[PDB]
Structure 1
Amino acid sequence: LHKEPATLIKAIDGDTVKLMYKGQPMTFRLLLVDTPETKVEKYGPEASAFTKKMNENAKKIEVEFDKGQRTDKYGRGLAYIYADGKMVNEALVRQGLAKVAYVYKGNNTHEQLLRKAEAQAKKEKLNIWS
């Protein structure tokens, strides 16, 4: 997989962000993570703020598509997002603000990495695992 530059337009939810990718606005859905929804579930606003803060404070945002389908039925790009080299998907799981979701159409490159982050958050009984 390879990383591509992107520019933040707007954070929408804990699991969704609007980015300028290769010249045009685009909504991205973070791969392999299920965050509480605000559109209001518990930890939903916490997950949203986390994603918002992490992307807004970064100097560089990069998107990394996996090897499976690159967009869902709603037209959102499916990717791993990096804020200053740190994967947003992983940070959410590690902080206990998201659960690892089921693999979707072959996009599983980072599933083990995320499963490990989740096991650790569970052990520490962080947020969602409270």
Structure 2
Amino acid sequence: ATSTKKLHKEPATLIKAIDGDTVKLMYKGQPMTFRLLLVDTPETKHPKKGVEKYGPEASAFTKKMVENAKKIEVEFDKGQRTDKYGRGLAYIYADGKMVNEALVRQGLAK
């Protein structure tokens, strides 16, 4: 009939995000990963871009968004931790702003 939509801001920053490979968040001690090594694409996996456009590039930008820019938090109190990808989707708001919308929205690296 009616669902409840509440968002609780809780400090959550990655301990070591590789980006180019895999990333892990720190939430209540739970290892919540954000996007893992997808399937191998024979007609996509390029050395130049590596992942989307440049590879390590978008990684370096995010590498700081987690290492130095440790101002990320979890903006979602839905309660569900797994259902979409299995704990691969987590709201990231570093410095009161999203990282996926920063440079990742430009096609990763760009």
Q: Structure 1 length normalisation: TM-score?
A: 0.51
Bigger relative contact order (CA 8 A; separation at least 6): 2
Deviation at 1:87, TM superposition (A): 0.7
Q: Structure 1 vs Structure 2: percent identity of aligned residues?
A: 98
Closer/same/farther in 2, CA of residues 65 and 32 from structure 1, 3 Å limit: farther
| Contact preservation (8 Å) 1:30, 1:79 | no
Deviation at 1:28, TM superposition (A): 2.4
Structure of greater Rg: 2
Closer/same/farther in 2, CA of residues 42 and 28 from structure 1, 3 Å limit: closer
- Count of residue pairs brought into register by the alignment: 97
| Contact preservation (8 Å) 1:61, 1:82 | yes
* Residue of structure 1 in register with 2:4 after alignment: none
Structure 2 unaligned blocks of 5 or more = 1-6, 46-51
| Contact preservation (8 Å) 1:30, 1:89 | no
Closer/same/farther in 2, CA of residues 23 and 70 from structure 1, 3 Å limit: closer
Q: Structure 2 length normalisation: TM-score?
A: 0.58
| Contact preservation (8 Å) 2:8, 2:75 | yes
Structure 1 unaligned blocks of 5 or more = 98-129
Please report the RMSD computed on the Cα atoms of aligned residues, expressed in angstroms: 5.1
* Structure richer in helix, relative to its length: 1
